[PDB]
Amino acid sequence: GSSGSSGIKILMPSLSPTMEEGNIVKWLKKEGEAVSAGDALCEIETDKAVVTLDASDDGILAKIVVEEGSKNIRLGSLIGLIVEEGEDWKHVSGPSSG
Known part of the structure; x- marks a missing residue:
């Protein structure tokens, strides 16, 4: 099939100076x-x-x-x-853009 997209992937930042991993307590934002x-x-x-x-x-x-x-x-x-x-965000579709 075919399905191209161009978004921004959020990768765990190095909040700490010497952190190997983190733990998302609670999301402050919703989808x-x-x-x-x-x-x-x-x-x-x-x-x-x-x-x-x-x-x-x-x-x-x-x-x-x-x-x-x-x-x-x-x-x-x-x-x-x-x-x-x-x-x-949900799903794009139509004549223009995809």
Whole structure:
């Protein structure tokens, strides 16, 4: 089949200076909601302390790969994708765009 897309994959940031993994306590955003750089997305758990995952870019919470409650979230792990505000996060389709 065929299905191309271009979104923003969210990978576990190196919140800590020497962190091997994290733990999403609770998502501060929901799927379909907008996102703004700086704003808190979710709470990342770390040995150091309780840190929060801030948005690096502004977009719509396409989906959430890793939901809250997960523990031991190594780095470079997709926890959710973002979609340019407007884009049919749910599912795009029609004459234009796909």
